[PDB]
């Protein structure tokens, strides 16, 4: 009984923090973002209604958490720990195109960005072998990435972090870019709690 | 100002979940209690506003958390020491007594309970030296407990887990009393959140 009432409050709470998470991300307050993230992670064990009503923002939130952690290469979201955060982000990105049924034309640019960031970050961290694996796994067909995938190989083999493809790649820029992509396929609902909060300090 | 809105909500969320945690404890639903506790923990790193309003709430939650975990002796809530959950529960009890402005007379009966279970549980557990330690530090003291100091003391050297004291000890019974005690120095309520769910599950 008192159950169906927690279930709806949980949902509201989950949605409230999701909203702040995006707000922290958008303002580049990644520390605030991870604290909020942890609260959301802890809510997931509680009953929330039916996936659908939150499966959409949970995926975006999933992609964002991996991206926020994209620069820590000894961090893993995958069960066995052989995946870099950006590799995990690519996976989540596919789950979004499949679940949201997005056209390939609406996803290739962004998917191409996460692949480039995944390889480049390894390079800046001198994980030239990690960079090689990721590069050859996601960029073989992935054709017209012809220049880039070919530039990267040379950058890796020459361990050239002075190369402008590396020198002009900024993770901060990549993050806000990805957030804009992810946000557009959303529902930035002014959650019930912020509105109640307003209707009260108002 | 966008910040003081979050503060207001976070306060509602903490109060709401604290309310559900007591409910869960009350129903001997300890797993749910534990999942809600972790949510509240993740909530504490965030701006709560002003600590005059959740500090009594917070202290009781601490006591209950330590009590719900009292049977796991390898678990510790102390940052510096190797303290059993029930030893840490005693210390919280002390902060409650100081902060709730209660008298020794009102508090000695519960804390007494805590000392007992802390020892018995060590004993019911074959941990006989800790049992001795806790008894000599906490109970190796008062009046009306000598008879008990001396019985728990012998039960120790003889390892008499076969003793009426030990066998008729009920932690479930223990837990529930502690909650009854802690509840009597706390209001009752309906948290703005739960109240608004009904006003809508309408």
């Amino acid at each position: 009984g008192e159950a169906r009432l927690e279930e709806a409050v949980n949902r509201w709470v989950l949605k409230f923090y999701f909203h702040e998470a995006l707000r922290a991300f958008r303002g580049s307050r990644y520390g605030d973002f991870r604290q909020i993230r942890d609260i959301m992670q802890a809510l997931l064990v509680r009953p929330l209604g039916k996936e659908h009503t939150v499966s959409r923002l949970l995926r975006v939130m999933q992609c964002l958490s991996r991206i926020e952690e994209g620069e820590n290469l000894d961090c893993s979201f995958d069960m066995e720990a052989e995946l870099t955060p950006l590799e995990s982000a690519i996976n989540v990105l596919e789950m979004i195109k499949t679940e949201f049924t997005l056209t390939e034309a609406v996803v290739e640019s962004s998917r191409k960005l996460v692949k480039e960031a995944a390889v480049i970050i390894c390079i800046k961290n001198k994980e030239f072998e990690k960079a090689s694996k990721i590069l050859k796994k996601h960029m073989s067909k992935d054709p017209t990435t012809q220049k880039l995938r070919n530039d990267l190989l040379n950058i890796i083999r020459e361990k050239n972090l002075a190369h402008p493809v590396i020198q002009n790649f900024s993770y901060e820029t990549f993050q806000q870019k990805m957030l804009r992509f992810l946000e557009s396929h959303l529902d930035d609902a002014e959650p019930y709690l912020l509105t109640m909060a307003k209707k009260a300090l108002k | 100002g966008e910040a003081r809105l979050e503060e207001a909500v976070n306060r509602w969320v903490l109060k709401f979940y604290f309310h559900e945690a007591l409910r869960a404890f009350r129903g001997s639903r300890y797993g749910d209690f534990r999942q809600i506790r972790d949510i509240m923990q993740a909530l504490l790193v965030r701006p709560l506003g002003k600590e005059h309003t959740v500090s009594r709430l917070l202290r009781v939650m601490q006591c209950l958390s330590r009590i719900e975990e009292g049977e796991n002796l390898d678990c510790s809530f102390d940052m510096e020491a190797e303290l059993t959950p029930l030893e840490s529960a005693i210390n919280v009890l002390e902060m409650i007594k100081t902060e709730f402005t209660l008298t020794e007379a009102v508090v000695e009966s519960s804390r007494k309970l805590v000392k007992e279970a802390a020892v018995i549980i060590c004993i019911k557990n074959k941990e006989f030296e800790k049992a001795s330690k806790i008894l000599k530090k906490h109970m190796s003291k008062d009046p009306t407990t000598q008879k008990l100091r001396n019985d728990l003391l012998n039960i120790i050297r003889e390892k008499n887990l076969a003793h009426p004291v030990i066998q008729n000890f009920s932690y479930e019974t223990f837990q529930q009393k502690m909650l009854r005690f802690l509840e009597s120095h706390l209001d009752d309520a309906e948290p703005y959140l739960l109240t608004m769910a009904k006003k809508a599950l309408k």
Partner: peptide, 16 residues
């Protein structure tokens, strides 16, 4: 030990 829910299905945090 127990009931996790959508905690792993929608894992937001690292294992690490």
């Amino acid at each position: 030990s127990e009931f996790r829910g959508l905690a792993l299905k929608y894992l937001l945090t690292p294992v690490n």
